[PDB]
Amino acid sequence: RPVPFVLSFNNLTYNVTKTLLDNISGETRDGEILAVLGASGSGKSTLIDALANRIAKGSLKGTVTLNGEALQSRMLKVISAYVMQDDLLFPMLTVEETLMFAAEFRLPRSLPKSKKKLRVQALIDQLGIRNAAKTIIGDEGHRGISGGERRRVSIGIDIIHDPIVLFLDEPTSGLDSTSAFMVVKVLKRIAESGSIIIMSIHQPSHRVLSLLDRLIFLSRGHTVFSGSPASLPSFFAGFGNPIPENENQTEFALDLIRELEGSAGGTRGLVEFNKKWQEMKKQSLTLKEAISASISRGKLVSPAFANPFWIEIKTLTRRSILNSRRQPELLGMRLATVIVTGFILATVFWRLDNSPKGVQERLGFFAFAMSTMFYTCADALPVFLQERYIFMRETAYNAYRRSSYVLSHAIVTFPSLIFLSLAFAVTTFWAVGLEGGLMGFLFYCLIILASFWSGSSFVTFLSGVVPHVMLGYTIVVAILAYFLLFSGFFINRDRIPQYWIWFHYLSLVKYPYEAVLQNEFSDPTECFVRGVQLFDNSPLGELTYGMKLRLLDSVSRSIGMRISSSTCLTTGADVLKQQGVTQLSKWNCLLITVGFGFLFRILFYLCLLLGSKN
Amino acid sequence: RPVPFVLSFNNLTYNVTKTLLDNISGETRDGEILAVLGASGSGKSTLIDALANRIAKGSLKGTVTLNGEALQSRMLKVISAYVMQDDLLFPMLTVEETLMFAAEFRLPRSLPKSKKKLRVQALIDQLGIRNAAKTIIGDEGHRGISGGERRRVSIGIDIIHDPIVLFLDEPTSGLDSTSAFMVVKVLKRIAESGSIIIMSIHQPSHRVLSLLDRLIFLSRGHTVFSGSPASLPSFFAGFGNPIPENENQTEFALDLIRELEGSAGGTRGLVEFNKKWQEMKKQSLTLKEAISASISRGKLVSPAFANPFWIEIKTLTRRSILNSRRQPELLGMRLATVIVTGFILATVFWRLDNSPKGVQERLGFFAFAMSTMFYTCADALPVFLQERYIFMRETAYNAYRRSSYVLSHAIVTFPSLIFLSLAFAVTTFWAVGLEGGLMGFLFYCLIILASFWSGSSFVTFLSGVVPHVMLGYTIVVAILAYFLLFSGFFINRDRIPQYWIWFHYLSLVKYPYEAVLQNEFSDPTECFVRGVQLFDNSPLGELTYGMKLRLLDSVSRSIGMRISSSTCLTTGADVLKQQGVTQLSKWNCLLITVGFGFLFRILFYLCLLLGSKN
Ligand SMILES: CC/C=C\C[C@H]1C(=O)CC[C@@H]1CC(=O)O
Ligand SMILES: CC/C=C\C[C@H]1C(=O)CC[C@@H]1CC(=O)O
């Protein structure tokens, strides 16, 4: 015996004015399924949105009462669930630990973990997915479970607290009819446990129509039929056109409503015929304690969040580790890109000399190397966009905080950024022949790591403002190119016009590039022009060694400074003065690179606030 | 009265061994539709591929005879058509001129154009698309015709010669059942004109099943049912499980075959039951002149190609012009990208002086400008991939040559490349302050045009080897970056190691970059170092004007050459010697850029040869 529940909704009118819903009425009990149909663009997605209070409230007029009293929004977040229309699952998780991660986010922390696992096992048996309980979910290619068992996993995630009311936006969409029958046979099994099912459906078959107990047909937001499937031949016989034998009901009726959308009559005669057809059928408790009676029967397993701030971080981190450990070809293809790019740069710029052309080749190596770190952070854009679509599904249920999501996402990607930074520094420090020994190599690893951190924080921020991968990849490639034009390599800082100098200081390439230059040209003992090398790239100075030695001391008669054959005119400190790299220290350039990464994680948080209302 | 035709096929076995088809048999007449069903992966796409001789011939064993004799491949290219499974249409064309372009490619040139237009008008009435005859076809967003009328346009393109046999791979795929009924009602109308229809179908309804006259159900390449729809209750009653009332036939039968794919029995009992069920129904001309009789009735309207080589170019060019004239926001968004990139570069590099830092800023302007021309050619990759999918549909019918496609594609894109080249040269020649006057500006326009020509030829070639836009866009961005590293700007040609110099000469950026450098530093009257400017970037030379004047003549005592206060040491010819730009002339650098574009149009032709067998 389940506790009886009755959901009644009357006079639902929704204006946006476009009047998308007009005088909808209905009634649903437990043990039954109310199916809503009618067209594409008919308003059935808007009808179950209005029944679930997921609207811009203040535009809906009408009463929605459960068991007699009312439905405010704070009761409907405890006893209801809304399964949205698609599957958005992590592919490398088995369906037992997919449902177990949902239990840790939503069921209370007062419940022991042994009883949480018992709820998952009882839900695996109630759904039709006992046969594949340790198979991974899979994707395009990893060979997991089928499309009809993925649908019962995404349904079973949303019913983890075992609600009393269950809203479903087209739960059989995209399935073949032998797996679209097992979905509705599971939804009939949930209804027999004491639940109220309200679902949208496109084209029900003859098999799933025996399981639906009530039907509502809509025609641009007007109800044109309301009743059992075994009243549909009796309904349209009174309208003037009965249903033939060996024809699918709710299919000829669905075609007749689309046929009656012409220009002479319209469906207004059918809206008026329905609202007096219901008038021929007129003849024929204790909601706060009825809910509490059902918790004693064993239904409602389940503060705004079930866990504190630190439990949600360690659960989100463990899920992201377990999902990327079982895909060890995403990190392997990122290691292989960085090593090949570093191997090419190390063999082109192999062992640069202390020539004036080797100084300009050092600046070109560093400008190209810093720009590859920011570009190779853009291949995380498809996986950064898979989540934030799963995240937007789970924050409708208050599964975890918005702070715990951004913090655990910044934590799990940081071990991969250390391996990428160490792989690029090992391939390029000793082969290009950079300066510093061991302390210069360690600063080289730190600023490569700070560039991977700020470049992935920038792509994380872009993955919250773009809809698809191609738009966000175009924006990365375009803005990185202008970060390189304004980095001080193509045109120096003291030569950039003053109406463009605001974008020089906003360049994400400028600060790591100015840090590796000051790490490189830091020794006072390095020398790039000695003695007779004053006359190399001038027309004066195509002469012999003995001829330029009297060219040197003939300059010493004028000034008084004696320039020997080895005087060390141009050092590394003079290279940085020629390029204009003088304003910030190399440790202050490292801190602006780390600080730019933190700013793009904060702007990513602020776009997840606005992305919930959008 | 139509001429009678009979298509009979027996003992079709196809091994690849995986035996994808095993002992298929059937018979089809005119006026009737043979529908093939059974599963996903069942082999129904392979069955109509074998009936249309579109296989690797030599692996099929079995006889396929039309009207008694045989079917070799040269008769089946005159009297048959194969409609493939999707719509691939140009969106800006009305459906009258979409069918009129198909008539000019396939109907013979002996036919007058007045009779070609009469064939299009008679086909518009036979299809269900008289109501939208001048509506454009449309796409994702341009609001053309509906999805069910797009299907009858793509069907009507393939029946433009009015064949006798019509193969159809799932012609109702992706349609709602009120538009999937009008497709089969049109296919029944074509059959009544004297045609043989053989189609695949997923999930027929109760309405389209009345139009199909024969059914063949397959179960991994074995026939399990063969007969009329009004023999399906009688068939499965003898198997042990009849069909219930108010259940869709060919749906319960389709589910039972999927149910009988278990592990104990299998469908082998049903394959054996079918091949003796057909044995209980055993009791109950002049093909070369039967075809010629039907041409007299008015069916077959239609050399390997219907038009000469030059008529196909002027028809393909007119179609590409008419399709892009009605989309004047693809060229407008390409003008807007080039002008904004040119405006940014002209205000950063505004009016460069004849300083040693203005020389290095000229090299960075030219390296950045030449790299934007090759990048902005990559936004033609989605439209270059829409065609070559339409082209691969139309070369199954020999609509036009492979030479006419590549030549007219290189012709229609060239007026847009002239406007892009003139827009970049106008924004940047006078603002950066480049040298040459008018003859230097005209060479500047020519090498920007040669860079747009070779960069779009490179993207045209990539659009014949990549499947999707995201892979080809990743390859462009990666290879352009290494074309810039090896262009001589980051490291000069005489400093590149000899194991990498093969890729320097293959760089697409090197030759236009070396042409604008030699156009710029060509005047013998330009000067970048004069007199006392010998001591600018050295520690010698932080002195006054009078102090360096005795530094000048003190060098003249040694050599004998007198260096005045104005001697013009470094000219533009010395800048090119310092960069190593000495091997090729600027006209020979322009010709290698034009010649690289022609090579990538030839490699694009050679990938359309291999792309037909692939
Ligand atoms: C060093 C970058 C080379 C060329 C610059 C171009 C890109 O690489 C991507 C964007 C830029 C053109 C644009 O979009 O304005
Ligand atoms: C001047 C180009 C700047 C950085 C180079 C990176 C790109 O811009 C695209 C590819 C390259 C990294 C790679 O893919 O190896």
mmCIF file of N, CA, C and O and ligand atoms in Angstrom, chain A residues 337 340-341 344 367-373 375-376 473 477 480 484 490, chain B residues 474 477-482 484-485 490, ligand 2:
data_model
loop_
_atom_site.group_PDB
_atom_site.id
_atom_site.type_symbol
_atom_site.label_atom_id
_atom_site.label_comp_id
_atom_site.label_asym_id
_atom_site.label_seq_id
_atom_site.Cartn_x
_atom_site.Cartn_y
_atom_site.Cartn_z
ATOM 1 N N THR A 337 52.252 16.291 -28.028
ATOM 2 C CA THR A 337 52.272 17.559 -28.748
ATOM 3 C C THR A 337 53.370 18.473 -28.220
ATOM 4 O O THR A 337 54.067 19.131 -28.999
ATOM 5 N N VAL A 340 56.996 17.062 -29.176
ATOM 6 C CA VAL A 340 57.311 17.245 -30.591
ATOM 7 C C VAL A 340 57.563 18.715 -30.910
ATOM 8 O O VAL A 340 58.499 19.046 -31.646
ATOM 9 N N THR A 341 56.769 19.619 -30.332
ATOM 10 C CA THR A 341 57.016 21.050 -30.500
ATOM 11 C C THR A 341 58.330 21.467 -29.852
ATOM 12 O O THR A 341 59.068 22.288 -30.403
ATOM 13 N N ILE A 344 61.284 20.095 -32.103
ATOM 14 C CA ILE A 344 61.504 20.888 -33.307
ATOM 15 C C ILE A 344 62.259 22.166 -32.967
ATOM 16 O O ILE A 344 63.248 22.510 -33.618
ATOM 17 N N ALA A 367 59.876 33.896 -27.940
ATOM 18 C CA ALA A 367 58.557 34.350 -28.357
ATOM 19 C C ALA A 367 57.747 33.221 -28.967
ATOM 20 O O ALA A 367 56.528 33.167 -28.786
ATOM 21 N N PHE A 368 58.400 32.314 -29.686
ATOM 22 C CA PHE A 368 57.703 31.161 -30.237
ATOM 23 C C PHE A 368 57.385 30.132 -29.164
ATOM 24 O O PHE A 368 56.331 29.500 -29.217
ATOM 25 N N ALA A 369 58.278 29.944 -28.191
ATOM 26 C CA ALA A 369 58.056 28.932 -27.162
ATOM 27 C C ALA A 369 56.938 29.330 -26.210
ATOM 28 O O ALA A 369 56.109 28.492 -25.850
ATOM 29 N N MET A 370 56.894 30.598 -25.796
ATOM 30 C CA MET A 370 55.817 31.060 -24.927
ATOM 31 C C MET A 370 54.467 31.053 -25.624
ATOM 32 O O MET A 370 53.447 30.885 -24.960
ATOM 33 N N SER A 371 54.435 31.207 -26.938
ATOM 34 C CA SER A 371 53.186 31.177 -27.677
ATOM 35 C C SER A 371 52.671 29.770 -27.933
ATOM 36 O O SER A 371 51.480 29.608 -28.207
ATOM 37 N N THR A 372 53.525 28.752 -27.861
ATOM 38 C CA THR A 372 53.052 27.381 -27.975
ATOM 39 C C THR A 372 52.436 26.874 -26.688
ATOM 40 O O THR A 372 51.614 25.962 -26.740
ATOM 41 N N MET A 373 52.823 27.429 -25.542
ATOM 42 C CA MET A 373 52.210 27.031 -24.283
ATOM 43 C C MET A 373 50.774 27.508 -24.197
ATOM 44 O O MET A 373 49.908 26.788 -23.697
ATOM 45 N N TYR A 375 48.837 28.148 -26.821
ATOM 46 C CA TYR A 375 48.051 27.490 -27.855
ATOM 47 C C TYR A 375 47.698 26.063 -27.468
ATOM 48 O O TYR A 375 46.576 25.617 -27.709
ATOM 49 N N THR A 376 48.639 25.322 -26.888
ATOM 50 C CA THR A 376 48.376 23.932 -26.542
ATOM 51 C C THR A 376 47.467 23.779 -25.339
ATOM 52 O O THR A 376 47.139 22.649 -24.985
ATOM 53 N N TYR A 473 37.643 27.936 -30.212
ATOM 54 C CA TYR A 473 38.960 27.696 -30.780
ATOM 55 C C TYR A 473 39.369 28.800 -31.742
ATOM 56 O O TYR A 473 40.557 29.094 -31.868
ATOM 57 N N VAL A 477 42.831 31.331 -31.105
ATOM 58 C CA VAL A 477 43.839 31.502 -32.143
ATOM 59 C C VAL A 477 43.951 32.966 -32.564
ATOM 60 O O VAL A 477 45.050 33.459 -32.837
ATOM 61 N N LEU A 480 45.482 35.007 -29.241
ATOM 62 C CA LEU A 480 46.884 34.655 -29.022
ATOM 63 C C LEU A 480 47.798 35.323 -30.041
ATOM 64 O O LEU A 480 48.912 35.731 -29.700
ATOM 65 N N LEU A 484 50.829 38.080 -29.177
ATOM 66 C CA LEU A 484 52.198 37.978 -29.655
ATOM 67 C C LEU A 484 52.643 39.233 -30.395
ATOM 68 O O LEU A 484 53.818 39.604 -30.319
ATOM 69 N N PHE A 490 57.560 41.774 -31.752
ATOM 70 C CA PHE A 490 57.433 42.318 -33.096
ATOM 71 C C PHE A 490 57.723 43.812 -33.117
ATOM 72 O O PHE A 490 58.336 44.317 -34.061
ATOM 73 N N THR B 474 42.548 22.744 -37.478
ATOM 74 C CA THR B 474 43.683 22.486 -36.602
ATOM 75 C C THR B 474 44.968 22.319 -37.405
ATOM 76 O O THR B 474 46.034 22.796 -36.995
ATOM 77 N N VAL B 477 46.250 25.853 -38.753
ATOM 78 C CA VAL B 477 46.845 26.674 -37.706
ATOM 79 C C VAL B 477 48.202 26.118 -37.277
ATOM 80 O O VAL B 477 49.131 26.881 -36.993
ATOM 81 N N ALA B 478 48.368 24.800 -37.302
ATOM 82 C CA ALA B 478 49.637 24.203 -36.907
ATOM 83 C C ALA B 478 50.702 24.339 -37.986
ATOM 84 O O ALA B 478 51.866 24.590 -37.675
ATOM 85 N N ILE B 479 50.332 24.183 -39.253
ATOM 86 C CA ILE B 479 51.321 24.214 -40.325
ATOM 87 C C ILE B 479 51.680 25.654 -40.699
ATOM 88 O O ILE B 479 52.829 25.930 -41.057
ATOM 89 N N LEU B 480 50.738 26.594 -40.579
ATOM 90 C CA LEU B 480 51.050 28.007 -40.787
ATOM 91 C C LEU B 480 52.048 28.522 -39.758
ATOM 92 O O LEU B 480 52.913 29.338 -40.089
ATOM 93 N N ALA B 481 51.965 28.028 -38.524
ATOM 94 C CA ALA B 481 52.901 28.419 -37.478
ATOM 95 C C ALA B 481 54.321 27.967 -37.778
ATOM 96 O O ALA B 481 55.269 28.705 -37.504
ATOM 97 N N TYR B 482 54.488 26.780 -38.347
ATOM 98 C CA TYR B 482 55.806 26.312 -38.745
ATOM 99 C C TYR B 482 56.247 26.871 -40.085
ATOM 100 O O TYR B 482 57.441 26.874 -40.370
ATOM 101 N N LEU B 484 55.874 30.008 -40.585
ATOM 102 C CA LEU B 484 56.390 31.276 -40.097
ATOM 103 C C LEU B 484 57.706 31.112 -39.348
ATOM 104 O O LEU B 484 58.563 31.998 -39.414
ATOM 105 N N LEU B 485 57.889 29.992 -38.646
ATOM 106 C CA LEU B 485 59.159 29.715 -37.991
ATOM 107 C C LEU B 485 60.275 29.486 -39.002
ATOM 108 O O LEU B 485 61.433 29.818 -38.733
ATOM 109 N N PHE B 490 62.163 34.370 -37.941
ATOM 110 C CA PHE B 490 62.583 34.007 -36.596
ATOM 111 C C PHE B 490 64.049 33.600 -36.565
ATOM 112 O O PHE B 490 64.768 33.918 -35.613
HETATM 113 C C1 LIG C 2 53.676 32.103 -34.227
HETATM 114 C C2 LIG C 2 52.785 30.868 -33.858
HETATM 115 C C3 LIG C 2 52.713 30.732 -32.319
HETATM 116 C C4 LIG C 2 52.730 29.538 -31.697
HETATM 117 C C5 LIG C 2 52.828 28.236 -32.477
HETATM 118 C C6 LIG C 2 51.612 27.321 -32.240
HETATM 119 C C7 LIG C 2 50.320 27.941 -33.125
HETATM 120 O O1 LIG C 2 50.017 29.061 -33.237
HETATM 121 C C8 LIG C 2 49.667 26.925 -33.710
HETATM 122 C C9 LIG C 2 50.628 25.683 -33.685
HETATM 123 C C10 LIG C 2 51.888 26.097 -32.728
HETATM 124 C C11 LIG C 2 52.017 25.011 -31.643
HETATM 125 C C12 LIG C 2 51.911 23.643 -32.283
HETATM 126 O O2 LIG C 2 50.814 23.203 -32.722
HETATM 127 O O3 LIG C 2 52.932 22.925 -32.377
#
